[PDB]
């Protein structure tokens, strides 16, 4: 009677701990695309600063 | 990110090349220059005839 709740909880928390971690990796792509697009925008805008100075 | 986005959209105004000058004002300057060149060509033809 002490084995059964401990065994059930050990079975359950093993998958509970790996659960809810998928939210991080599915939210990661939005930040990744935002950072990459803004970084290539940053280098494009630095070149735009140089070309605007030339103009 | 939104600030960067409409700042880029306002400065580019749909062109890949940067548009510092007002584009319709720029082509207004260009057509004034071209029509002035045509008038100058007519005037110099009249000067040569005179």
- A-chain CB neighbours of B11 within 8 Å are 48
Task: Please say whether the beta carbons of B19 and B12 come within 8 A.
Answer: yes
Burial of A41 (0-12, 13-18, 19+ CB in 10 A): middle
Backbone angles phi, psi at B45, to 5 degrees: -65, -45
SS3 B14: coil
Using alpha carbons, select from B16, B28, B17 the residue that is nearest to residue A55: B17
> How far apart are alpha carbons B32 and B44 in whole angstroms?
18
Task: Please say whether the beta carbons of A51 and B18 come within 8 A.
Answer: yes
Residue ranges in A1-55 assigned as alpha helix (H):
3-18, 22-54
In this structure, what DSSP letter does residue B15 have?
-
Provide CB contacts within 8 A for A1, sequence distance 6+: none
> How far apart are alpha carbons A44 and A41 in whole angstroms?
5
> How far apart are alpha carbons B1 and A35 in whole angstroms?
10
Q: Which method resolved this structure?
A: cryo-EM
> How far apart are alpha carbons B4 and A37 in whole angstroms?
11
> How far apart are alpha carbons B17 and B23 in whole angstroms?
12
CB of A19 within 8 Å of a chain B CB? The answer is no
CB of B4 within 8 Å of a chain A CB? The answer is yes
HSE-CB of B34 using CA atoms within 13 angstroms: 6
């Amino acid at each position: 009677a002490s084995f059964i709740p401990a065994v059930n909880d050990l079975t359950s928390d093993l998958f509970r701990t790996k659960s809810k971690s998928e939210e991080i990796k599915i939210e990661l792509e939005k930040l990744e695309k935002n950072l990459t697009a803004t970084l290539v925008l940053e280098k494009c805008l630095q070149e735009d600063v140089k070309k605007a100075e030339l103009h | 990110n939104k600030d960067v986005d409409m700042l880029c959209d306002t400065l580019y105004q749909g062109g890949n090349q940067l548009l510092l000058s007002d584009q319709e004002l720029t082509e207004q300057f260009h057509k004034v220059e071209s029509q002035l060149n045509k008038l100058n060509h007519l005037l110099t033809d009249i000067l040569a005839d005179v």
